[PDB]
Structure formats: C-alpha cells, structure tokens
mmCIF file of C-alpha atoms and ligand atoms in Angstrom:
data_model
loop_
_atom_site.group_PDB
_atom_site.id
_atom_site.type_symbol
_atom_site.label_atom_id
_atom_site.label_comp_id
_atom_site.label_asym_id
_atom_site.label_seq_id
_atom_site.Cartn_x
_atom_site.Cartn_y
_atom_site.Cartn_z
ATOM 1 C CA UNK A 1 -10.865 1.970 -1.945
ATOM 2 C CA UNK A 2 -7.575 3.463 -2.985
ATOM 3 C CA UNK A 3 -4.903 5.262 -0.972
ATOM 4 C CA UNK A 4 -1.962 7.627 -1.213
ATOM 5 C CA UNK A 5 0.558 8.805 1.380
ATOM 6 C CA UNK A 6 2.413 12.027 0.837
ATOM 7 C CA UNK A 7 4.976 10.923 3.390
ATOM 8 C CA UNK A 8 7.851 9.416 1.397
ATOM 9 C CA UNK A 9 5.926 9.981 -1.819
ATOM 10 C CA UNK A 10 7.934 10.170 -5.110
ATOM 11 C CA UNK A 11 7.066 10.153 -8.849
ATOM 12 C CA UNK A 12 6.731 6.377 -8.708
ATOM 13 C CA UNK A 13 4.440 5.948 -5.618
ATOM 14 C CA UNK A 14 2.180 8.694 -7.092
ATOM 15 C CA UNK A 15 2.188 6.926 -10.486
ATOM 16 C CA UNK A 16 1.168 3.772 -8.593
ATOM 17 C CA UNK A 17 -1.751 5.670 -6.839
ATOM 18 C CA UNK A 18 -2.956 7.139 -10.121
ATOM 19 C CA UNK A 19 -2.836 3.644 -11.689
ATOM 20 C CA UNK A 20 -4.996 2.277 -8.785
ATOM 21 C CA UNK A 21 -7.442 5.173 -9.073
ATOM 22 C CA UNK A 22 -7.907 4.445 -12.802
ATOM 23 C CA UNK A 23 -8.282 0.729 -12.090
ATOM 24 C CA UNK A 24 -10.904 1.384 -9.432
ATOM 25 C CA UNK A 25 -13.271 2.874 -12.020
ATOM 26 C CA UNK A 26 -15.441 0.165 -13.514
ATOM 27 C CA UNK A 27 -16.104 -0.274 -17.263
ATOM 28 C CA UNK A 28 -17.529 -3.128 -19.393
ATOM 29 C CA UNK A 29 -16.186 -1.774 -22.722
ATOM 30 C CA UNK A 30 -13.065 -0.020 -24.149
ATOM 31 C CA UNK A 31 -13.424 2.380 -27.036
ATOM 32 C CA UNK A 32 -10.289 2.606 -29.147
ATOM 33 C CA UNK A 33 -8.613 0.782 -26.275
ATOM 34 C CA UNK A 34 -9.627 3.483 -23.623
ATOM 35 C CA UNK A 35 -11.826 2.340 -20.779
ATOM 36 C CA UNK A 36 -15.376 3.653 -21.319
ATOM 37 C CA UNK A 37 -16.873 4.791 -18.034
ATOM 38 C CA UNK A 38 -20.455 3.560 -17.280
ATOM 39 C CA UNK A 39 -23.728 5.403 -18.014
ATOM 40 C CA UNK A 40 -24.624 5.129 -14.402
ATOM 41 C CA UNK A 41 -24.159 3.129 -11.246
ATOM 42 C CA UNK A 42 -26.890 2.654 -8.604
ATOM 43 C CA UNK A 43 -26.496 2.891 -4.848
ATOM 44 C CA UNK A 44 -23.281 3.260 -2.919
ATOM 45 C CA UNK A 45 -21.178 1.421 -5.593
ATOM 46 C CA UNK A 46 -21.355 4.705 -7.475
ATOM 47 C CA UNK A 47 -18.739 6.143 -5.044
ATOM 48 C CA UNK A 48 -15.032 5.390 -4.808
ATOM 49 C CA UNK A 49 -13.337 6.311 -1.476
ATOM 50 C CA UNK A 50 -9.800 7.777 -1.824
ATOM 51 C CA UNK A 51 -7.829 7.853 1.444
ATOM 52 C CA UNK A 52 -5.295 10.739 1.213
ATOM 53 C CA UNK A 53 -2.687 11.141 3.994
ATOM 54 C CA UNK A 54 -0.636 14.238 4.488
ATOM 55 C CA UNK A 55 3.031 14.289 5.225
ATOM 56 C CA UNK A 56 2.266 14.086 8.943
ATOM 57 C CA UNK A 57 0.014 11.090 8.532
ATOM 58 C CA UNK A 58 -3.330 12.910 8.934
ATOM 59 C CA UNK A 59 -6.048 11.876 6.663
ATOM 60 C CA UNK A 60 -9.093 12.633 4.617
ATOM 61 C CA UNK A 61 -11.353 10.306 2.625
ATOM 62 C CA UNK A 62 -12.553 11.753 -0.648
ATOM 63 C CA UNK A 63 -15.719 10.417 -2.307
ATOM 64 C CA UNK A 64 -15.414 10.056 -6.113
ATOM 65 C CA UNK A 65 -18.264 9.230 -8.517
ATOM 66 C CA UNK A 66 -17.045 6.350 -10.676
ATOM 67 C CA UNK A 67 -19.003 7.347 -13.788
ATOM 68 C CA UNK A 68 -17.343 10.739 -14.243
ATOM 69 C CA UNK A 69 -14.394 10.948 -11.800
ATOM 70 C CA UNK A 70 -16.207 13.813 -10.114
ATOM 71 C CA UNK A 71 -15.235 14.586 -6.511
ATOM 72 C CA UNK A 72 -18.476 14.948 -4.472
ATOM 73 C CA UNK A 73 -17.229 15.548 -0.934
ATOM 74 C CA UNK A 74 -14.814 14.188 1.670
ATOM 75 C CA UNK A 75 -14.605 13.238 5.309
ATOM 76 C CA UNK A 76 -12.208 14.955 7.642
ATOM 77 C CA UNK A 77 -12.162 13.395 11.147
ATOM 78 C CA UNK A 78 -15.831 13.298 12.191
ATOM 79 C CA UNK A 79 -17.067 15.985 9.778
ATOM 80 C CA UNK A 80 -18.170 15.343 6.228
ATOM 81 C CA UNK A 81 -18.186 18.102 3.594
ATOM 82 C CA UNK A 82 -20.024 18.188 0.225
ATOM 83 C CA UNK A 83 -20.259 20.554 -2.650
ATOM 84 C CA UNK A 84 -23.481 22.488 -2.939
ATOM 85 C CA UNK A 85 -25.058 20.689 -5.917
ATOM 86 C CA UNK A 86 -27.669 17.993 -6.512
ATOM 87 C CA UNK A 87 -25.169 15.255 -7.367
ATOM 88 C CA UNK A 88 -23.197 15.724 -4.064
ATOM 89 C CA UNK A 89 -26.412 15.948 -2.083
ATOM 90 C CA UNK A 90 -27.294 12.565 -3.570
ATOM 91 C CA UNK A 91 -23.838 11.218 -2.624
ATOM 92 C CA UNK A 92 -24.398 12.376 0.981
ATOM 93 C CA UNK A 93 -27.047 9.694 1.271
ATOM 94 C CA UNK A 94 -24.524 6.949 0.603
ATOM 95 C CA UNK A 95 -21.106 7.972 1.959
ATOM 96 C CA UNK A 96 -19.683 9.060 5.357
ATOM 97 C CA UNK A 97 -23.100 8.522 6.999
ATOM 98 C CA UNK A 98 -21.310 8.010 10.327
ATOM 99 C CA UNK A 99 -19.862 11.634 10.407
ATOM 100 C CA UNK A 100 -20.918 13.430 13.562
ATOM 101 C CA UNK A 101 -21.847 16.595 11.528
ATOM 102 C CA UNK A 102 -22.191 17.269 7.679
ATOM 103 C CA UNK A 103 -21.305 20.625 6.219
ATOM 104 C CA UNK A 104 -22.393 21.640 2.818
ATOM 105 C CA UNK A 105 -19.778 23.876 1.233
ATOM 106 C CA UNK A 106 -21.034 27.233 -0.034
ATOM 107 C CA UNK A 107 -20.208 26.456 -3.684
ATOM 108 C CA UNK A 108 -20.671 23.698 -6.200
ATOM 109 C CA UNK A 109 -17.760 21.682 -7.500
ATOM 110 C CA UNK A 110 -17.216 23.005 -10.944
ATOM 111 C CA UNK A 111 -14.060 24.873 -11.723
ATOM 112 C CA UNK A 112 -15.892 28.173 -12.337
ATOM 113 C CA UNK A 113 -17.560 28.388 -8.930
ATOM 114 C CA UNK A 114 -14.418 27.077 -7.152
ATOM 115 C CA UNK A 115 -12.226 29.744 -8.738
ATOM 116 C CA UNK A 116 -14.738 32.441 -7.785
ATOM 117 C CA UNK A 117 -14.717 31.175 -4.186
ATOM 118 C CA UNK A 118 -10.909 30.882 -4.163
ATOM 119 C CA UNK A 119 -10.406 34.368 -5.580
ATOM 120 C CA UNK A 120 -7.958 32.893 -8.132
ATOM 121 C CA UNK A 121 -8.155 31.242 -11.612
ATOM 122 C CA UNK A 122 -6.387 27.957 -11.410
ATOM 123 C CA UNK A 123 -3.827 29.240 -13.984
ATOM 124 C CA UNK A 124 -2.418 30.982 -10.882
ATOM 125 C CA UNK A 125 -2.536 28.168 -8.331
ATOM 126 C CA UNK A 126 0.619 25.987 -8.013
ATOM 127 C CA UNK A 127 0.024 22.263 -8.053
ATOM 128 C CA UNK A 128 2.161 19.206 -7.364
ATOM 129 C CA UNK A 129 2.808 16.835 -4.501
ATOM 130 C CA UNK A 130 3.637 19.658 -2.152
ATOM 131 C CA UNK A 131 0.424 21.566 -3.107
ATOM 132 C CA UNK A 132 -1.460 18.292 -2.505
ATOM 133 C CA UNK A 133 -0.010 17.886 0.999
ATOM 134 C CA UNK A 134 -1.092 21.485 1.844
ATOM 135 C CA UNK A 135 -4.599 20.762 0.452
ATOM 136 C CA UNK A 136 -5.121 17.643 2.622
ATOM 137 C CA UNK A 137 -3.955 19.834 5.546
ATOM 138 C CA UNK A 138 -6.321 22.746 4.631
ATOM 139 C CA UNK A 139 -9.320 20.457 4.315
ATOM 140 C CA UNK A 140 -8.735 18.981 7.775
ATOM 141 C CA UNK A 141 -10.284 22.190 9.284
ATOM 142 C CA UNK A 142 -13.125 23.977 7.828
ATOM 143 C CA UNK A 143 -12.283 27.226 6.129
ATOM 144 C CA UNK A 144 -14.444 27.733 3.046
ATOM 145 C CA UNK A 145 -12.218 30.263 1.165
ATOM 146 C CA UNK A 146 -9.056 28.225 1.748
ATOM 147 C CA UNK A 147 -10.893 24.951 1.003
ATOM 148 C CA UNK A 148 -11.852 26.205 -2.482
ATOM 149 C CA UNK A 149 -8.133 26.598 -3.417
ATOM 150 C CA UNK A 150 -7.234 23.269 -1.813
ATOM 151 C CA UNK A 151 -10.065 21.517 -3.697
ATOM 152 C CA UNK A 152 -8.698 23.008 -7.011
ATOM 153 C CA UNK A 153 -5.343 21.401 -6.096
ATOM 154 C CA UNK A 154 -7.029 18.171 -5.045
ATOM 155 C CA UNK A 155 -9.161 17.778 -8.244
ATOM 156 C CA UNK A 156 -6.232 18.367 -10.590
ATOM 157 C CA UNK A 157 -3.821 16.174 -8.761
ATOM 158 C CA UNK A 158 -6.233 13.235 -8.462
ATOM 159 C CA UNK A 159 -9.101 13.284 -10.983
ATOM 160 C CA UNK A 160 -7.459 15.291 -13.840
ATOM 161 C CA UNK A 161 -4.326 13.111 -13.523
ATOM 162 C CA UNK A 162 -6.359 9.877 -13.614
ATOM 163 C CA UNK A 163 -8.045 11.285 -16.815
ATOM 164 C CA UNK A 164 -4.850 12.267 -18.683
ATOM 165 C CA UNK A 165 -1.480 10.645 -18.651
ATOM 166 C CA UNK A 166 0.019 14.038 -19.563
ATOM 167 C CA UNK A 167 -1.454 15.627 -16.387
ATOM 168 C CA UNK A 168 -0.170 12.688 -14.315
ATOM 169 C CA UNK A 169 3.339 13.366 -15.783
ATOM 170 C CA UNK A 170 3.012 17.097 -14.974
ATOM 171 C CA UNK A 171 2.324 16.266 -11.363
ATOM 172 C CA UNK A 172 5.226 13.838 -11.280
ATOM 173 C CA UNK A 173 7.534 16.616 -12.497
ATOM 174 C CA UNK A 174 6.133 18.661 -9.579
ATOM 175 C CA UNK A 175 6.909 15.992 -7.019
ATOM 176 C CA UNK A 176 9.133 18.251 -4.916
ATOM 177 C CA UNK A 177 8.414 21.714 -6.284
ATOM 178 C CA UNK A 178 4.883 22.998 -6.998
ATOM 179 C CA UNK A 179 4.253 24.838 -10.162
ATOM 180 C CA UNK A 180 1.188 26.437 -11.736
ATOM 181 C CA UNK A 181 -0.344 24.114 -14.453
ATOM 182 C CA UNK A 182 0.877 24.421 -18.114
ATOM 183 C CA UNK A 183 -1.740 25.894 -20.539
ATOM 184 C CA UNK A 184 -2.008 22.419 -22.100
ATOM 185 C CA UNK A 185 -2.947 21.003 -18.651
ATOM 186 C CA UNK A 186 -5.680 23.695 -18.496
ATOM 187 C CA UNK A 187 -6.708 22.867 -22.126
ATOM 188 C CA UNK A 188 -6.859 19.108 -21.409
ATOM 189 C CA UNK A 189 -8.944 19.696 -18.267
ATOM 190 C CA UNK A 190 -11.474 21.769 -20.098
ATOM 191 C CA UNK A 191 -11.778 19.344 -23.098
ATOM 192 C CA UNK A 192 -12.324 16.059 -21.239
ATOM 193 C CA UNK A 193 -16.042 15.934 -22.012
ATOM 194 C CA UNK A 194 -15.452 17.109 -25.628
ATOM 195 C CA UNK A 195 -12.742 14.493 -26.247
ATOM 196 C CA UNK A 196 -14.745 11.781 -24.585
ATOM 197 C CA UNK A 197 -17.650 12.444 -26.929
ATOM 198 C CA UNK A 198 -15.675 12.833 -30.204
ATOM 199 C CA UNK A 199 -13.837 9.567 -29.415
ATOM 200 C CA UNK A 200 -17.129 7.872 -28.970
ATOM 201 C CA UNK A 201 -18.567 9.463 -32.136
ATOM 202 C CA UNK A 202 -15.447 8.460 -34.153
ATOM 203 C CA UNK A 203 -16.484 4.796 -33.604
ATOM 204 C CA UNK A 204 -19.090 4.916 -36.363
ATOM 205 C CA UNK A 205 -17.158 7.411 -38.412
ATOM 206 C CA UNK A 206 -13.918 5.560 -39.321
ATOM 207 C CA UNK A 207 -11.906 7.057 -36.421
ATOM 208 C CA UNK A 208 -12.774 10.612 -37.664
ATOM 209 C CA UNK A 209 -14.209 13.291 -35.257
ATOM 210 C CA UNK A 210 -17.648 14.659 -36.067
ATOM 211 C CA UNK A 211 -16.387 17.937 -34.582
ATOM 212 C CA UNK A 212 -12.664 18.675 -34.096
ATOM 213 C CA UNK A 213 -11.418 19.424 -30.554
ATOM 214 C CA UNK A 214 -9.111 22.513 -30.187
ATOM 215 C CA UNK A 215 -6.294 22.129 -27.622
ATOM 216 C CA UNK A 216 -3.072 23.882 -26.626
ATOM 217 C CA UNK A 217 0.120 21.763 -26.943
ATOM 218 C CA UNK A 218 3.288 21.119 -24.859
ATOM 219 C CA UNK A 219 5.171 23.660 -26.989
ATOM 220 C CA UNK A 220 2.715 26.385 -26.015
ATOM 221 C CA UNK A 221 0.337 26.861 -28.967
ATOM 222 C CA UNK A 222 -3.029 26.001 -30.581
ATOM 223 C CA UNK A 223 -3.848 22.679 -32.352
ATOM 224 C CA UNK A 224 -6.870 20.818 -33.748
ATOM 225 C CA UNK A 225 -7.529 17.137 -32.868
ATOM 226 C CA UNK A 226 -9.477 15.538 -35.726
ATOM 227 C CA UNK A 227 -9.257 11.754 -35.410
ATOM 228 C CA UNK A 228 -8.205 8.839 -33.205
ATOM 229 C CA UNK A 229 -4.631 8.681 -34.561
ATOM 230 C CA UNK A 230 -3.814 11.721 -32.422
ATOM 231 C CA UNK A 231 -1.288 11.280 -29.539
ATOM 232 C CA UNK A 232 -4.060 12.803 -27.363
ATOM 233 C CA UNK A 233 -6.190 9.742 -28.175
ATOM 234 C CA UNK A 234 -3.568 6.983 -28.527
ATOM 235 C CA UNK A 235 -1.500 7.682 -25.417
ATOM 236 C CA UNK A 236 -2.762 10.678 -23.384
ATOM 237 C CA UNK A 237 -6.498 10.231 -22.399
ATOM 238 C CA UNK A 238 -7.010 7.234 -20.023
ATOM 239 C CA UNK A 239 -10.777 7.359 -19.378
ATOM 240 C CA UNK A 240 -13.888 8.246 -21.347
ATOM 241 C CA UNK A 241 -16.891 10.090 -20.030
ATOM 242 C CA UNK A 242 -19.756 8.078 -21.479
ATOM 243 C CA UNK A 243 -21.769 10.086 -24.057
ATOM 244 C CA UNK A 244 -24.907 9.192 -22.069
ATOM 245 C CA UNK A 245 -23.649 11.780 -19.529
ATOM 246 C CA UNK A 246 -22.816 14.580 -22.025
HETATM 247 C C1 LIG B 1 -5.956 12.737 -38.718
HETATM 248 O O1 LIG B 1 -4.890 13.410 -38.093
HETATM 249 C C2 LIG B 1 -3.722 13.568 -38.886
HETATM 250 C C3 LIG B 1 -2.764 14.385 -38.045
HETATM 251 O O2 LIG B 1 -2.409 13.622 -36.924
HETATM 252 C C4 LIG B 1 -3.972 14.303 -40.209
HETATM 253 O O3 LIG B 1 -2.838 14.292 -41.069
HETATM 254 C C5 LIG B 1 -1.926 15.432 -41.071
HETATM 255 O O4 LIG B 1 -2.475 16.600 -41.713
HETATM 256 C C6 LIG B 1 -1.854 17.097 -42.915
HETATM 257 C C7 LIG B 1 -2.011 16.154 -44.152
HETATM 258 O O5 LIG B 1 -3.359 15.917 -44.555
HETATM 259 C C8 LIG B 1 -0.399 17.523 -42.568
HETATM 260 O O6 LIG B 1 -0.371 18.903 -42.263
HETATM 261 C C9 LIG B 1 0.178 16.746 -41.365
HETATM 262 O O7 LIG B 1 1.590 16.721 -41.396
HETATM 263 C C10 LIG B 1 -0.398 15.311 -41.317
HETATM 264 N N1 LIG B 1 0.371 14.479 -40.391
HETATM 265 C C11 LIG B 1 0.509 13.144 -40.456
HETATM 266 C C12 LIG B 1 1.370 12.537 -39.380
HETATM 267 O O8 LIG B 1 -0.014 12.414 -41.293
HETATM 268 C C13 LIG B 1 -5.115 13.677 -40.984
HETATM 269 O O9 LIG B 1 -5.389 14.543 -42.087
HETATM 270 C C14 LIG B 1 -6.322 13.399 -40.053
HETATM 271 N N2 LIG B 1 -7.342 12.562 -40.684
HETATM 272 C C15 LIG B 1 -8.657 12.866 -40.615
HETATM 273 C C16 LIG B 1 -9.563 11.887 -41.318
HETATM 274 O O10 LIG B 1 -9.136 13.860 -40.011
HETATM 275 N N1 ADE B 2 -15.356 18.259 -8.485
HETATM 276 C C1 ADE B 2 -14.652 17.862 -9.582
HETATM 277 N N2 ADE B 2 -14.177 16.598 -9.619
HETATM 278 C C2 ADE B 2 -13.466 16.148 -10.684
HETATM 279 N N3 ADE B 2 -13.179 16.895 -11.795
HETATM 280 C C3 ADE B 2 -13.662 18.161 -11.748
HETATM 281 N N4 ADE B 2 -13.532 19.173 -12.688
HETATM 282 C C4 ADE B 2 -14.167 20.276 -12.208
HETATM 283 N N5 ADE B 2 -14.671 20.021 -11.010
HETATM 284 C C5 ADE B 2 -14.382 18.710 -10.708
#
C-alpha cells in the first residue's frame, strides 16, 4: 500500500507519495531506462491500495490496477464504489470485499464519460493539492455528479502524476493554489498510451518512432516527438503501458 496525507502536505511530501506510488508498480524490465509495466497480473496482486487522507484526517482507499495505473474504485467508510466497466467489476471481486454495501457508479472511468457526467471538460477543472483535498471530501459521501469531478481531480493528481514527471511538477506548483491543467498536461494525459507504444517500438528501430507522437509544449504550442532522445522520453515519462495492453 501507499499513503498520502493532505494535512501538512507540501511539494516535498507529495513528491515523496508520487515516488512511492511509482515504486509500488511492479516491472521486470526497463525500456530505455523507464520501468515497463507488466502484461498482466493475476488475482488480488493486480490492485494497489492508495490511502488518501483529507486535511481533516478522513480517509478513502483507492484501488489502482498495477498494469496500467487505472483507478478502478475506492472505499469510503463502509461503502465501496466502482466505475461501471468490466475491468472495475473484475476488481470488485478482489478489493474492499468487507464493505457493507457496494455502489457501482453510473459511468465508466475514462475521461470522456467522466467529463460528460461532471458537466465539464477537465480543461476547466482546477487541480492541485487543494482540489485533491476537496475530492477526498466529495467522495466520502455519495453524490454521483460531484464524484465525477472529484474523480477527474483524483486521477490527474495521482495516476497522471505518477506517469509524467511534468504532471507531478504541475501539481507541486499547485500545492497551495489550484489551477486548471496546462494544455501540455492535457496533451501528456491523452498521449500516454501512444508514447508507451512508440517507446517500445523504438527498441527495434534504433530509438526512432514508427509513428511520431504530437504533443503541446510548456511554451504553449504544437510539437512532434520522433525518437527516444526527446526530453519527453529521457526525463518526463516515468512508466510504460506495456504494448500487450494497447
Ligand atoms: C530525433 O529528435 C531530434 C530532435 O530532438 C531531431 O533533430 C532535430 O531536428 C532538426 C535537424 O534534423 C532540427 O530542426 C532540430 O534543431 C534538431 N535538434 C537537435 C537537438 O538535434 C532528429 O532529427 C530526430 N531523429 C530521428 C531519427 O527522428
Ligand atoms: N480511471 C482512470 N485511472 C487512471 N488514469 C485514467 N485516465 C482516464 N481515466 C483514468
């Protein structure tokens, strides 16, 4: 398990949580010196439990699938919640079995459904440590519309940050003031799968991408990532989605 307390949290204790979250995800191989996540994991070992604690010390346990960093559900008090999709339904067989009741949310977990349910594209939803403390708080009591927005916050803070050092740094900058994500944050979120595959394909292709990945940069404009010498590859991405899952 890993853990994070919003109470007293600063850029460094968050950095330390995001480190632990990365280091909880098993791998047997590194590709260009980036942990390569497993094809699959059987049984309960598939699921990492994150204990998040709001500013007041109230808590939720989030279940994360260690092959893709995908959040499947969480436990609030004696109620478990899960996204409405086959992979979360599977997870429900392994985690939080002692919850008094299980609610299945009325959406799946992908950004497009969550945004629909939230009424907002995540370009318009502030994130940061304060947004994360709100989200923990929201998810403590079932409200499906408000949960969708909180889950957007939760996914980007925790999973998207473990995936990209850049997104981790963005959150750190938003330690005490939330702010909507940069376009490059959005770009990086939406290319994880694409990058993970091109980095794996570069391995028999002299570091060169079979297909270039188009991002948006820090500056605020469009760029093509064509090989493993890119900053995106050499310092930004921290985890690879195995091509066996793409
Ligand atoms: C790999 O990526 C680098 C960019 O990081 C490419 O080189 C650049 O592209 C052209 C020259 O061919 C110039 O516009 C840039 O200034 C170059 N930058 C640097 C730092 O060299 C390179 O062409 C790519 N290689 C492959 C095989 O795709
Ligand atoms: N549920 C989820 N968990 C992690 N990353 C995601 N990206 C979109 N949805 C996600």
